[PDB]
Amino acid sequence: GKGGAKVLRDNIQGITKPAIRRLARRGGVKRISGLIYEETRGVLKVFLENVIRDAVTYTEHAKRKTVTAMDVVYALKRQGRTLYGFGG
Amino acid sequence: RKVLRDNIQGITKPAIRRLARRGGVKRISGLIYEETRGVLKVFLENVIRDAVTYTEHAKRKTVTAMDVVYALKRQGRTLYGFGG
Amino acid sequence: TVALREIRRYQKSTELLIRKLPFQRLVREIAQDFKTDLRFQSSAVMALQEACEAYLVGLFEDTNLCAIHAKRVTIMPKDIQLARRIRGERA
Amino acid sequence: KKPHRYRPGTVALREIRRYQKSTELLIRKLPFQRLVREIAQDFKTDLRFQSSAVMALQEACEAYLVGLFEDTNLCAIHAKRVTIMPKDIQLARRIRGER
Amino acid sequence: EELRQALMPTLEALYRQDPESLPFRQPVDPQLLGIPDYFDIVKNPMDLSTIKRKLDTGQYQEPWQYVDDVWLMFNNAWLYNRKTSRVYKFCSKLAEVFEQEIDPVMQSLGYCCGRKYEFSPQTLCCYGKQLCTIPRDAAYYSYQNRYHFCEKCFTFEKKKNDTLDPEPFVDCKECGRKMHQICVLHYDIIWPSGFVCDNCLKKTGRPRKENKFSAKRLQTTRLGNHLEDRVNKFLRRQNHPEAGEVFVRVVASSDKTVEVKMSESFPYRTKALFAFEEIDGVDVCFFGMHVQEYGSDCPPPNTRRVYISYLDSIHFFRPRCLRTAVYHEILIGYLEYVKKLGYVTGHIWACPPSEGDDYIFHCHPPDQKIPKPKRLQEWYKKMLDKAFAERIIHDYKDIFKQATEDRLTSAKELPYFEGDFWPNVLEESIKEKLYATMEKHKEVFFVIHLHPDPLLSCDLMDGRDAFLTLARDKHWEFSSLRRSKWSTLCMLVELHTQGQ
Amino acid sequence: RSRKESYSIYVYKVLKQVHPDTGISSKAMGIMNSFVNDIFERIAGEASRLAHYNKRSTITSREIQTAVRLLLPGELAKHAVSEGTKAVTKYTSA
Amino acid sequence: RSRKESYSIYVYKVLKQVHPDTGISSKAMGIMNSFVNDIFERIAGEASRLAHYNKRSTITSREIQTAVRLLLPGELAKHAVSEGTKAVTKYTSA
Amino acid sequence: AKTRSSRAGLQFPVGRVHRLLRKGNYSERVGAGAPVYLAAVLEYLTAEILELAGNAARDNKKTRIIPRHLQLAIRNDEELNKLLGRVTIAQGGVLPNIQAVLLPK
Amino acid sequence: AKTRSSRAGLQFPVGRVHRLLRKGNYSERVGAGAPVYLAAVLEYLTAEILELAGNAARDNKKTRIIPRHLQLAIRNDEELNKLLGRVTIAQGGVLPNIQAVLLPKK
DNA sequence: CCATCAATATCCACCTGCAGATTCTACCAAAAGTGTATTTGGAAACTGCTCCATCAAAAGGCATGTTCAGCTGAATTCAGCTGAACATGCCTTTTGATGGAGCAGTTTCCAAATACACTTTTGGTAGAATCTGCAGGTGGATATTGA
DNA sequence: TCAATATCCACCTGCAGATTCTACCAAAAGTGTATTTGGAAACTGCTCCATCAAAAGGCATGTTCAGCTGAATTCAGCTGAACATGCCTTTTGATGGAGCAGTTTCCAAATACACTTTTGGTAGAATCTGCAGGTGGATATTGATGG
């Protein structure tokens, strides 16, 4: 045992290659180059850089230690990517 | 008030060529000019119509630069130097 | 050679590139199509002209990038169409 | 000897049709959650996340990736090509104004 | 200073793991971690900091003590922590790091390797009942670590089956260094003059004496010669640089009879063969399988029939890509040989092994996959298709399709083989729908239509049971490449010196 | 257990008005609520900007009509303008 | 004539502080005014929206600092936050 | 006696729209007919989108409106697509569209 | 007799900014340090853009800031370009930028 | 491949005159700051409470790794040809001056929207019971593909 | 034409989610006075916008041809389709507790005036000047002649 409670890594490579393949297939991509994955992961990290920063700032102002879905959707709508279904 | 028509031809071929050169374009095909005129007409439909509606909302009969600036801003085309 | 010459010349300068009278006539015609008996200010006409020049410059630079993306230096209608579609102006 | 094999592309089109006809999430939940938590820690430590927030991030990221891949496919088609390369991604992002 | 400077890099590599090494950087504190039962299970608690203190103090006379201490810490961490716990994964990662780091430095010191190897938890057998085994984590009674009895047989020191047997060690006659016997591949019978280190022989000039107990020097047979020739031809046409010479030898061949549980008894000839490959300059056994052959004099329906009773293989063949092709080549060569001899029908029982059960080679590697029945059927179908491509196999079907094509109506027409599942099914039916059983196991059994070796007396290999018993008793495991090499050397020595 | 504001009942009544025999899932219901809230925010913001442009401190039906004309597409804008005019006339005559 | 306020004097003083020997044209001053008005509108809108988000009817320096961090990227945001905090501390110290 | 929504003949809550406008800090004062107009516009848009979603569900052989039907209805209408061009959906998917060059032969 | 703008050590008008915030109907109440923070941020941004315009003018041997120099200066700064990515300045032009492909390919 | 007579757009060395930016005096309604009583949005203090993290285990849907080749991406020629560069002609675009259509400044006051005290209605919603559309597995007729 | 294979579709069954009541209860909605103020309407001075005169800096056509481009060709190799292997994510179930938010108390801060203080376009007067061309070089620079 010796448990009861819980490194800053294993984040960018967490997105699997078949996940990127499925995302491309949903977008109508028929042929995928073998080296698309790394820059796709980089662009994804850029998007998270843009979104989670605003979400974290909103949470910090609210004197809260937990990020809520309202903050996430609100950062999404302030960035021009308004999302529906998480406004409850 | 004379009814103006066929004023889209006022955007001359050298004007479109110069605009392409300003954008770094080196070669222009023969049919680019008409498409560019159509795109400009679409942009005018998007902007001037909003400006006209803004002017009508203010009960005014003259279009002002402030209405144009607000219409451009609401369409994500904010412009400086004309107020607002 | 020469084409690059006027490219550099127009990139250096900032003067208005579309003639004033034809643009004013086109704006008057399209507004009359929207609504007749509509007076125009000179500042409003200048604002329309400058906004249109900026939009056309942006469209042209995006079109050139699309054209060189297809290993070409001459822009095609597909370049403008796809640039506008990616910009969200079409789809 | 002679194994049955579809011509390349057919199964790709089948997968495209299947993923377009369905709306389920494609990215695995746990690695995406780990990435989100790591980025949040890069911002500020001790920041908890709700399950609804993680689902919202996943949905938004999947939608953005789908749109980017559609633009990338259009850019690849523009050059008489059917394969996606980084130049298409860069062109699409530059036109979108993100770069 | 020499020992400290030699052993510091591996210990530092163990420390630098993050966060694998974090729980092991300090002594385990039951009070701090809330684990009062830690001392009840681990009787010798110690950690990496203790290792560093001993190295700095020079408490190690020779590095094998350090290796034993590190592996004891690994074993204690594995035992106390559950397999799903993160501490178990951290300990496993540290063990892998130690294994890949100690070997170069430990060799540069002048030894074989820096690993403390413990044998697999082998299940003990019984002397009285002769058919009872002691499962793991079960109490038993042992006498002199040589005789074993279970709980039921009691109605002798009491022990538990959760212990491990350490690997043997050898000491150099001249240098005096201690090293693993398996890693150096030294046997007393092969070299009666003792064990001499490689460096010591380098100071002598004369290399190690040639081993006469090799697979190449085994007695040759026409079937084995044909199989080895086919395998060598396939390897040559592939021309794989990593591929080595393969020797196929028949080490056991005799005549037996099967008794019905219709002729009272059916005579047959049994033969056993193995495949050995040259890896790293030594022979490694990678394939073995048993056949039963009924000739023209056998009463029907077994007349002119070959049956594959057991089939085993080792996944250490090099290259791995050609392993399946080599197995196919061996089996197709056997089928061609039996077809040339005049046999008509062949039978294959494609039944995957159960977990913990060994057909021929004891202690299969943990990473060796036990194929599912569907995968085994697909493999056999691919092999039969390949054989058919070479106009060798006339046809191949399943037992149910063959039976319904032959319009069989009586159980006496069914083939009878030793230890075969179908005689057991028939006996169960008699004691207590045959076509239903045939259809249920339709894909399991394969029936193949195809259209002078002297008897070798070998009591050791006369059946898989004695071979497995000797392998279990002598700890001849196949869980690793070095263990497989040691097992192959030992079996070759046993066959050469204990032949009849 | 704070009072959570929503347009659930009214949107369900509208659905019954258009599709009496068709239901709506909770996820789609939240989609509709979020969409209506977003449109409300857009119209209110545009009306506020219109009021600020003319130095007006009060927002009337004309401001919202102009906001709808600016935001909604042509046919949708015309239909919404007609519906709003009918609603205002009915409320005045009530 | 109705007075039309502008940041002309303040922008001119800032320019003189930064570049004493550099002048400014009327078009450049108009661009200055448009830019400062747009920045003020954006930051005020962000602050108002954020105050609405947390059910807060009062906008303080914390809301504006958060909105500055949201809007300005990186170094601009850090310097703006530092100078705003310094100015607030100076104001509250008197 | 009669609610403002019932008086104006609209299902959407007029008084609630007025309250939200007042609390939204949009303007110092709000006109009487402004909540009525806004509620009418919102109800018209909701009715149109719900009708389109029901038509899509009928075309999809389903009697319950799902986000897939909603997104199909939104994208199948050019005006609705233009209005919601910057709106992300949850569990909505994309239109079936295969590029001409990707098509065989 | 000390103004709030001078009290906070800022050149931008604190009172004018506070009055504009009140007039914009952004919120019911505005904090006291809110106009001060607004003035500080606006003054910082104005000083940054003005110094960039001055550097651009100096690079072109000019003593008066023109919209061209300002547009070039802000487009040069990646942070300023991101801030004003959807902003057009009249009479500002574009950055001189020619692709290597557009150059002669001798 | 390239060293270089010769026609050409333009950086700079320059400078002068003018529209534009800068300097000074005055005025005053528009803000701006200070003073005081009032109201309140929000800080702290404690706690009830809901979902956030963490731990355990099986196992099957894919993540991972390997192989063959179909054909896709990439490189090379070349010829029909669309456009670039340029001389020629002329005319349309640009600038300035001049009547009045509406843009704003002033005053009344009336329909219109706050402020607020109740009263009644009405939307979440605690909680249990019955209805119901499609999640999921089965089976076989039906396109779809490749040789 | 045919065999291998994914698809459509009808059908049957278990269940979390959508739908129907019972009773509640606080949050608004509406109604009836009192007050105030946004602005419709009438009248009117002041812009500046449309219209028209001439002067000029360009635009519209046709010609010639070096070069952009798309069809045709060929081929190295890239990833798609198939298959073996096995990995680890999901769901189910539970739990210690960090953390969210309701409730109460109460205070520094925001607010509504009133008065006094400063003050920034604003209008007119007069001074200063940055640079837009233009004139005389003149300088890379590139198409072209030729070594």
| Number of other CB atoms surrounding residue B29 within 10 Å | 12
How far apart are the CA of E35 and the nearest CA of chain A, in angstroms? 7
CATH number at residue E103: 1.20.920.10
Instruction: Print the SS3 string covering C5-73.
Output: HHHHHHHHCCCCCCCHHHHHHHHHHHHHHHCCCCEECHHHHHHHHHHHHHHHHHHHHHHHHHHHHCCCC
E175 part of a folded domain: no
Match domain C1-91 to its CATH number in 3.40.50.1000, 3.40.50.300, 1.10.3720.10, 1.10.20.10.
1.10.20.10
One-letter amino acid for residue B60 of the chain = R
DSSP state of D25: -
**Distance of CA E455 to CAs D42, E250, F36, Å?**
75, 10, 92
Phi and psi for A16 in degrees, rounded to 5?
-75, 155
Q: Does F69 sit within 8 Å of B74, measured CB to CB?
A: no
Task: Tell me the longest C-alpha to C-alpha distance in chain G.
Answer: 49
Q: Are 3 or more Cβ–Cβ pairs between E and C shorter than 8 Å?
A: no
**Distance of CA H18 to CAs A71, F69, H1, H24, I24, Å?**
26, 20, 19, 10, 20
The residue ranges of DSSP E strands in F13-60, in sequence order, are: 23-24, 58-59
**Distance of CA A29 to CAs D8, E413, H4, Å?**
14, 60, 53
| Number of other CB atoms surrounding residue H8 within 10 Å | 26
**Distance of CA E355 to CAs E160, E239, E372, G33, Å?**
22, 36, 12, 81
End-to-end CA distance of chain D: 52
Element (H, E) at E345: strand E345-349
Cβ(A11)–Cβ(A23) below 8 Å = no
| Number of other CB atoms surrounding residue I59 within 10 Å | 12
Give the bases of strand J that a protein CB approaches within 7 Å: 9-12, 20-22, 30-34, 41-42, 51-57, 62-64, 66-67, 70-74, 82-86, 92-95, 102-105, 112-114, 121-126, 133-134, 145-147
**Distance of CA I32 to CAs G61, I18, I80, Å?**
8, 9, 29
Q: Does F34 sit within 8 Å of A84, measured CB to CB?
A: yes
Cβ(I74)–Cβ(G68) below 8 Å = no
CA atoms within 13 Å, Cβ hemisphere of D16: 24
Q: Are 3 or more Cβ–Cβ pairs between G and C shorter than 8 Å?
A: no
Identify the bridge partners of residue E445 per DSSP, sorted by sequence position: E349
Residue E428 buriedness (CB in 10 A; 0-12 / 13-18 / 19+): exposed
**Chain H positions touching chain G (beta carbons under 8 Å):** 24-25
E181 part of a folded domain: no
One-letter amino acid for residue C59 of the chain = L
How far apart are the CA of H91 and the nearest CA of chain C, in angstroms? 20
Give the bases of strand K that a protein CB approaches within 7 Å: 4-7, 17-19, 27-31, 38-40, 48-51, 58-60, 68-70, 78-90, 98-102, 109-111, 117-123, 130-131, 142-143
DSSP state of F4: -
| Number of other CB atoms surrounding residue I78 within 10 Å | 11
Rounded CA-CA distance A54/H10 in Å is: 39
Q: Which of G37, G39, G64, G36 is nearest to G50 (CA)?
A: G64
One-letter amino acid for residue B39 of the chain = V
A85 touches chain H (CB under 8 A): yes
Rounded CA-CA distance A13/E124 in Å is: 46
Residue set of the binding site of E for acetyl-CoA: 311-313, 323-324, 370, 375, 379
Q: Residues near A78 by Cβ (< 8 Å), separated by ≥ 6?
A: A54, G46, G49, G70
Cβ(H22)–Cβ(H4) below 8 Å = no
| Number of other CB atoms surrounding residue A15 within 10 Å | 23
Q: What per-residue string of b and e applies to E291-321 under the rule 16 or more CB within 10 Å gives b?
A: bbbbbeebeebbebbbbbbbbbbbebbbeee
Cβ(A52)–Cβ(D56) below 8 Å = no
DSSP state of E122: P
A88 touches chain H (CB under 8 A): no
Cβ(F54)–Cβ(H57) below 8 Å = no
Domain of residue E455, residue span? 222-497
CATH number at residue E133: 2.10.110.40
Element (H, E) at A66: strand A66-67
Rounded CA-CA distance E4/H79 in Å is: 79
How far apart are the CA of F45 and the nearest CA of chain B, in angstroms? 11
Residue B12 buriedness (CB in 10 A; 0-12 / 13-18 / 19+): middle
CATH number at residue H60: 1.10.20.10
Identify the bridge partners of residue E268 per DSSP, sorted by sequence position: E256
Element (H, E) at E466: helix E464-473
Q: Which two tokens mark D4? A: 């049955």
Identify all chain D residues contacting A44, using CB atoms and an 8 Å cutoff. Answer: 61, 65
Identify all chain C residues contacting H86, using CB atoms and an 8 Å cutoff. Answer: 88
Cβ(I36)–Cβ(I4) below 8 Å = yes
Identify all chain A residues contacting D97, using CB atoms and an 8 Å cutoff. Answer: none
CATH number at residue G85: 1.10.20.10
Identify all chain F residues contacting A85, using CB atoms and an 8 Å cutoff. Answer: 27, 30-31, 34
Q: Which of I70, I106, I61 is nearest to I89 (CA)?
A: I70
Q: Which of E255, E248, E251 is nearest to E270 (CA)?
A: E255
Q: Residues near C91 by Cβ (< 8 Å), separated by ≥ 6?
A: C85, H81
Q: Are 3 or more Cβ–Cβ pairs between D and G shorter than 8 Å?
A: no
Instruction: Print the SS3 string covering E70-121.
Output: HHHHHHHHHHHCCCCCHHHHHHHHHHHHHHHHHHHHHHHHCCCCCCCCECCC
Q: Residues near B71 by Cβ (< 8 Å), separated by ≥ 6?
A: B47, B50, B51, B54
Residue G81 buriedness (CB in 10 A; 0-12 / 13-18 / 19+): buried
Residue G38 buriedness (CB in 10 A; 0-12 / 13-18 / 19+): middle
Bond from prior residue into E319 cis (ω within 30 degrees of 0): yes
Report the residue from B27, B31, B43 with minimal CB separation from C52: B43
Cited resolution, angstroms = 4.2
I86 touches chain H (CB under 8 A): no
The residue ranges of DSSP E strands in H1-105, in sequence order, are: 29-30, 64-65, 87-88
Alpha helices (runs of H) in A1-88, residue ranges in sequence order: 17-26, 36-61, 69-78
- Structure-token match 């789908």, residue found: D66
Please report the residues numbered 59 through 78 in chain I whose beta carbons come closer than 8 angstroms to any beta carbon of chain B.
67
Distance H95 CA to K69 C1' (A): 35
How far apart are the CA of F71 and the nearest CA of chain B, in angstroms? 9
Q: Which of H41, H21, I91, H105 is nearest to C57 (CA)?
A: I91
One-letter amino acid for residue I100 of the chain = A
How many pairs of residues across B and F have Cβ atoms under 8 Å apart? 23
**Chain E positions touching chain A (beta carbons under 8 Å):** 18-19, 23, 28, 33-35, 80-82, 85-87
Q: Which of H73, H67, H70 is nearest to H90 (CA)?
A: H67
Rounded CA-CA distance E156/E177 in Å is: 36
Rounded CA-CA distance E244/A65 in Å is: 64
If you count them, how many residues does chain E have? 500
F78 touches chain B (CB under 8 A): no
Domains held by chain G: number: 1
Radius of gyration of chain C (CA): 16
E405 part of a folded domain: yes
How far apart are the CA of D2 and the nearest CA of chain H, in angstroms? 24
Rounded CA-CA distance E232/E329 in Å is: 10
Mind giving me the DSSP string for E299-344?
PTTSTTEEEEEEEEE-TT-SSSTTHHHHHHHHHHHHHHHHHHHT--
One-letter amino acid for residue D21 of the chain = K
Question: Pairing mode, if any, of strands C39-40 and D48-49?
Answer: unpaired
Domain of residue F46, residue span? 26-93
- Structure-token match 């406004």, residue found: A87
- Provide the residue ranges of all domains of chain D, joining segments of one domain with +: 2-99
Q: Residues near E271 by Cβ (< 8 Å), separated by ≥ 6?
A: E223, E250, E252, E253, E290, E291, E293, E453
Radius of gyration of chain I (CA): 19
Sign of CA dihedral E389, E395, E396, E401: positive
Radius of gyration of chain B (CA): 16
Instruction: Print the SS3 string covering I38-55.
Output: HHHHHHHHHHHHHHHHHH
Rounded CA-CA distance C90/C84 in Å is: 6
Please report the residues numbered 1 through 60 in chain F whose beta carbons come closer than 8 angstroms to any beta carbon of chain A.
4, 27, 30-31, 33-35, 37-38
Domain of residue B75, residue span? 1-82
Domain of residue I95, residue span? 1-105
How far apart are the CA of G1 and the nearest CA of chain I, in angstroms? 20
Bond from prior residue into E19 cis (ω within 30 degrees of 0): yes
Cβ(I31)–Cβ(G61) below 8 Å = yes
| Number of other CB atoms surrounding residue I105 within 10 Å | 7
Rounded CA-CA distance C60/C43 in Å is: 25
H46 touches chain I (CB under 8 A): no
Distance G25 CA to J26 C1' (A): 26
Question: Pairing mode, if any, of strands A66-67 and D48-49?
Answer: parallel
Q: Which residue of D has its CA nearest to C77?
A: D78
Rounded CA-CA distance E413/E405 in Å is: 13
Task: Tell how far CA E216 is from the center of its chain.
Answer: 21
Cβ(E294)–Cβ(E302) below 8 Å = yes
Residue I64 buriedness (CB in 10 A; 0-12 / 13-18 / 19+): exposed
Q: Which two tokens mark H102? A: 């990707």
Rounded CA-CA distance C81/B35 in Å is: 10
Cβ(E298)–Cβ(E305) below 8 Å = yes
* CA angle (A59 as vertex; A56, A65 as ends), nearest 5: 100
Q: Residues near B39 by Cβ (< 8 Å), separated by ≥ 6?
A: C56, C59, C80, C84
Q: Residue E163: left (phi > 0), alpha (psi -120 to 50), or beta?
A: beta
Q: Which chains touch B (3 or more CB pairs under 8 A)?
A: C, F, G, I
Let me know whether E445 and E344 are in one domain.
yes
Q: Which residue of D has its CA nearest to E389?
A: D1
The residue ranges of DSSP E strands in D15-89, in sequence order, are: 48-49, 83-84
Q: Which two tokens mark E144? A: 């002199």
Q: Residues near E13 by Cβ (< 8 Å), separated by ≥ 6?
A: E97, E98, E101
If you count them, how many residues does chain F have? 94
Element (H, E) at D53: helix D51-78
SS3 state at I25? coil
If you count them, how many residues does chain C have? 91
Identify all chain E residues contacting A2, using CB atoms and an 8 Å cutoff. Answer: 23, 28, 33, 35, 80-81, 85, 87
* CA angle (E90 as vertex; E21, D43 as ends), nearest 5: 75
Phi and psi for B70 in degrees, rounded to 5?
-65, -40
Alpha helices (runs of H) in I1-106, residue ranges in sequence order: 4-7, 14-23, 33-59, 67-76, 78-83
Match domain D2-99 to its CATH number in 3.10.20.30, 3.40.50.300, 2.60.40.10, 1.10.20.10.
1.10.20.10
SS3 state at E157? strand
Let me know whether E479 and E436 are in one domain.
yes
G62 part of a folded domain: yes
Identify all chain G residues contacting A70, using CB atoms and an 8 Å cutoff. Answer: 53
Alpha helices (runs of H) in E314-463, residue ranges in sequence order: 323-341, 373-389, 399-406, 421-431, 434-440
Phi and psi for F46 in degrees, rounded to 5?
-65, -40
CATH number at residue A36: 1.10.20.10
Rounded CA-CA distance H87/D63 in Å is: 10
Residue H34 buriedness (CB in 10 A; 0-12 / 13-18 / 19+): buried
Rounded CA-CA distance B74/C51 in Å is: 13
**Distance of CA E407 to CAs D84, E80, E401, G63, Å?**
60, 62, 10, 90
Rounded CA-CA distance E451/E448 in Å is: 9
Domains held by chain H: number: 1
Cβ(F68)–Cβ(F47) below 8 Å = no
Q: Which of E347, E475, E335, E322 is nearest to E422 (CA)?
A: E347
Q: Which of E349, E345, E230, E227 is nearest to E293 (CA)?
A: E345
Domains held by chain A: number: 1
Q: Which two tokens mark E61? A: 């006379």
Element (H, E) at E253: strand E246-259
DSSP state of E456: B
Q: Which two tokens mark F14? A: 């509208």
One-letter amino acid for residue E192 of the chain = P
- Structure-token match 């006379």, residue found: E61
